[PDB]
Amino acid sequence: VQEIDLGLTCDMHVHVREGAMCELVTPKIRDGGVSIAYIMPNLQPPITTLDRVIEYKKTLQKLAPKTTFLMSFYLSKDLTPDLIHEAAQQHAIRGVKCYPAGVTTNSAAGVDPNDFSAFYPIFKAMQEENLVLNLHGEKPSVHDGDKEPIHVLNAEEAFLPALKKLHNDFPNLKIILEHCTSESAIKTIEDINKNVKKATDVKVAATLTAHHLFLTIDDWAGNPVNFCKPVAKLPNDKKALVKAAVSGKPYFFFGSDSAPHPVQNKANYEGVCAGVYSQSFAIPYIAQVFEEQNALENLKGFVSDFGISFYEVKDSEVASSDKAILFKKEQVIPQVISDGKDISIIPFKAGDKLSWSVRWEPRL
Amino acid sequence: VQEIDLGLTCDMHVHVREGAMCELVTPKIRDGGVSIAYIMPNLQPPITTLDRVIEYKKTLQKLAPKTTFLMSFYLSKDLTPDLIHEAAQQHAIRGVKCYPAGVTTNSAAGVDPNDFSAFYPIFKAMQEENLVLNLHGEKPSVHDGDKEPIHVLNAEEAFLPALKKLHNDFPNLKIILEHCTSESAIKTIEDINKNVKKATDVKVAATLTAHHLFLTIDDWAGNPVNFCKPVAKLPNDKKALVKAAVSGKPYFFFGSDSAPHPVQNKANYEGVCAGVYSQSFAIPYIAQVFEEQNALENLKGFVSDFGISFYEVKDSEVASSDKAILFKKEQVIPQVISDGKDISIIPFKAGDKLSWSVRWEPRL
Numbered sequence: 001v002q003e004i005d006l007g008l009t010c011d012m013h014v015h016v017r018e019g020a021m022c023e024l025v026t027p028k029i030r031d032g033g034v035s036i037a038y039i040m041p042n043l044q045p046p047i048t049t050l051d052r053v054i055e056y057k058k059t060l061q062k063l064a065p066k067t068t069f070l071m072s073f074y075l076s077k078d079l080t081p082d083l084i085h086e087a088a089q090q091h092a093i094r095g096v097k098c099y100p101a102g103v104t105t106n107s108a109a110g111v112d113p114n115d116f117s118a119f120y121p122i123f124k125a126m127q128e129e130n131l132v133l134n135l136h137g138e139k140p141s142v143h144d145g146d147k148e149p150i151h152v153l154n155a156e157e158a159f160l161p162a163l164k165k166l167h168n169d170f171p172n173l174k175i176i177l178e179h180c181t182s183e184s185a186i187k188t189i190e191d192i193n194k195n196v197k198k199a200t201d202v203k204v205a206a207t208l209t210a211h212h213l214f215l216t217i218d219d220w221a222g223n224p225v226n227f228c229k230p231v232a233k234l235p236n237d238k239k240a241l242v243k244a245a246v247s248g249k250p251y252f253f254f255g256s257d258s259a260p261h262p263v264q265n266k267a268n269y270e271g272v273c274a275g276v277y278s279q280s281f282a283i284p285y286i287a288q289v290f291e292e293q294n295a296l297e298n299l300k301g302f303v304s305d306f307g308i309s310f311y312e313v314k315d316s317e318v319a320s321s322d323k324a325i326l327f328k329k330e331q332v333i334p335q336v337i338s339d340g341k342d343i344s345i346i347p348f349k350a351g352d353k354l355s356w357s358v359r360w361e362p363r364l
Numbered sequence: 365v366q367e368i369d370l371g372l373t374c375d376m377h378v379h380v381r382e383g384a385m386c387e388l389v390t391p392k393i394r395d396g397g398v399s400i401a402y403i404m405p406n407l408q409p410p411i412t413t414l415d416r417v418i419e420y421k422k423t424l425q426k427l428a429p430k431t432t433f434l435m436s437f438y439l440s441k442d443l444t445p446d447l448i449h450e451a452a453q454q455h456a457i458r459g460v461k462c463y464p465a466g467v468t469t470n471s472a473a474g475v476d477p478n479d480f481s482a483f484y485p486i487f488k489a490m491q492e493e494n495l496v497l498n499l500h501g502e503k504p505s506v507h508d509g510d511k512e513p514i515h516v517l518n519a520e521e522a523f524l525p526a527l528k529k530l531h532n533d534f535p536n537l538k539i540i541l542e543h544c545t546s547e548s549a550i551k552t553i554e555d556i557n558k559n560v561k562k563a564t565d566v567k568v569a570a571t572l573t574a575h576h577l578f579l580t581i582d583d584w585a586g587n588p589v590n591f592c593k594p595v596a597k598l599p600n601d602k603k604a605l606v607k608a609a610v611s612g613k614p615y616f617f618f619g620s621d622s623a624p625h626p627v628q629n630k631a632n633y634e635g636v637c638a639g640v641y642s643q644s645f646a647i648p649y650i651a652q653v654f655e656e657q658n659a660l661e662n663l664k665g666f667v668s669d670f671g672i673s674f675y676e677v678k679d680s681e682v683a684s685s686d687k688a689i690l691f692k693k694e695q696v697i698p699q700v701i702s703d704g705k706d707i708s709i710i711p712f713k714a715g716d717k718l719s720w721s722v723r724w725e726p727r728l
């Protein structure tokens with residue numbers, strides 16, 4: 001069979017929850033082919049204190065000894081510059097993730113993106129400490145009308161001005177637009193990096209999930225098992241995301257936004273939970289897209305090089321030097337991923353076949 | 365004011381199913397404030413024979429004796445022109461409802477709206493007997509190359525050319541574009557009727573449901589109770605649909621498409637059944653919209669005059685001359701509508717309050 005050496009794979013956008021769900025999914029980071037994971041903080045309650053973020057990490061390290069864990073704070077009014085400096089100096093966090101209020105899971109305690117200025121003390125601290133500002137780039141929905149209405153299909157586009165202002169007011173702050181879903185977002189990211197030479201000139205980057213390289217609105221209309229935020233959009237939007245993933249440009253890299261929910265939280269008649277579970281086959285999902293685009297040469301950059309470069313991951317922190325090797329063995333996605341107790345998850349593309357699998361090999 | 369006499373209200377898009385669902389739902393046409401109801405044919409198997417429509421009608425008359433029932437055929441691969449003639453002259457049907465294949469509930473036995481020509485002999489038979497052809501105007505979805513993609517958001521707009529051709533080849537045929545959802549469809553219906561002098565000049569008309577005057581995509585993204593076909597679209601579309609409802613023009617009138625399903629067919633993680641159940645409060649729902657637009661003068665035309673005029677309903681056919689009286693008593697929509705046995709339904713806008721109720725008064 002043929003093999004592809006991918007090195008230290010990166011998934012810079014992971015949800016791993018708490019409790020038994022966390023014991024179920026955290027080992028699946030490695031099985032999915034991912035060596036380094038950026039952990040998102042939207043627990044209940046949100047992670048806003050130093051002791052709890054340092055209480056979450058070793059719990060994950062205990063569940064997965066070989067996986068490198070970059071942690072984050074949840075952007076909240078309970079954060080202070082001294083908290084940001086203390087957390088950075090103790091190597092507890094690697095960035096702060098912002099959730100607009102009400103737009104996705106556990107975002108009710110979030111910020112209004114028609115402000116952001118109230119968090120300028122926080123951004124100055126993060127800029128001084130070289131932390132990353134992660135943005136769930138969606139404006140909350142407004143349907144009445146003075147300004148043009150915001151809804152799930154243009155909310156991301158309506159957010160692009162807020163990103164542009166943040167980057168102008170903080171030119172040295174590393175900012176990621178998480179899980180880009182619209183062509184407008186791709187063009188804004190490309191234009192911001194118009195005079196970019198090498199990868200380290202990138203200060204504003206964007207992550208792309210696995211599922212948005214497959215899904216369009218027709219896949220989640222009537223299928224809550226494919227419903228997520230931001231919502232998958234039009235075929236032209238999916239084309240732009242795929243061309244950006246295989247582009248080879250250093251300001252697009254992989255962030256799965258694997259968001260597990262028990263099956264009974266997706267089979268609601270109202271209030272369905274947003275989120276697609278992709279951890280168990282994260283790298284093979286991406287390999288399939290890259291294979292169909294005849295762009296497999298560019299896979300290592302999108303899932304490994306560019307995320308390590310942007311996050312400045314050193315071997316000093318990496319928990320294991322094992323290399324993820326992709327090999328072309330066909331496999332079938334199970335129908336459920338269960339902990340054999342109370343938790344069952346429907347995986348992304350359940351029942352479908354993938355051309356690749358993943359194994360680990362040490363270095364030297 | 366306090367009371368509005370709406371006369372003989374008509375809901376020209378009704379689904380009542382069979383069995384225990386039917387016994388539950390059919391009496392709620394009258395409870396909703398509707399005297400005349402056009403019954404749809406998408407049962408299992410579809411209604412395509414004279415014996416099955418008549419027995420269906422007899423069941424509905426037994427369950428709701430004071431409700432006037434207009435029946436329909438399912439546009440099917442085994443319908444015949446002489447069937448249309450025999451059914452029309454026996455006064456068993458008033459029209460044939462077309463379902464594009466796969467686009468909605470029980471549409472698998474449907475048509476491909478790209479080769480309507482196979483049904484022109486049937487359309488020519490319906491034209492001769494002055495029957496109504498009801499159109500679920502949506503093209504089936506296309507993601508597969510060359511041709512521009514079709515999805516739930518433009519499937520209605522992609523269907524408008526077919527409606528245009530069908531009316532051009534059959535100018536005397538009464539055709540209804542059922543449940544409009546897009547501004548594109550509204551503008552096309554306006555253009556088809558540019559200089560129509562009054563209601564009997566209308567031959568291509570459009571029905572608006574109750575739920576499409578409230579809903580947008582943000583309401584059904586995470587709420588399968590509000591998921592239906594065609595999907596509710598953008599605020600700009602709802603602007604047009606609402607405006608057309610209160611328009612006072614005779615080519616827009618009420619058709620609820622109340623489509624009941626048991627709750628367990630809505631709380632799926634995939635394959636959610638399309639359909640919003642609104643029968644039980646059909647007229648009060650619409651009264652809310654006409655009230656909020658300060659257009660209650662036009663409620664009688666939208667909910668009674670134009671439907672009766674277009675379908676040319678005569679007093680000889682009506683099962684009861686009782687008048688629908690709308691009166692401003694506040695009521696609360698239940699959380700569930702149950703038959704006390706196996707069937708529970710979440711009504712549209714469950715738990716919300718309506719400013720109006722409806723009662724019946726006889727003709728003396």
Ligand SMILES: O=c1[nH]cc(F)c(=O)[nH]1
Pocket residue numbers: 015042104105136228229230257259260274275276
């Ligand atoms: O962006 C997100 N979508 C869905 C989730 F469950 C989550 O936790 N975060």
Ligand SMILES: O=c1[nH]cc(F)c(=O)[nH]1
Pocket residue numbers: 379406468469500592593594621623624637638639640
């Ligand atoms: O147009 C329709 N949508 C949903 C249904 F269940 C139905 O029967 N008809």
Ligand SMILES: [Zn+2]
Pocket residue numbers: 104136178179229230257
């Ligand atoms: Zn997010």
Ligand SMILES: [Zn+2]
Pocket residue numbers: 013015040257259
């Ligand atoms: Zn996320």
Ligand SMILES: [Zn+2]
Pocket residue numbers: 468500542543593594621
């Ligand atoms: Zn329909």
Ligand SMILES: [Zn+2]
Pocket residue numbers: 377379404621623
């Ligand atoms: Zn219908």
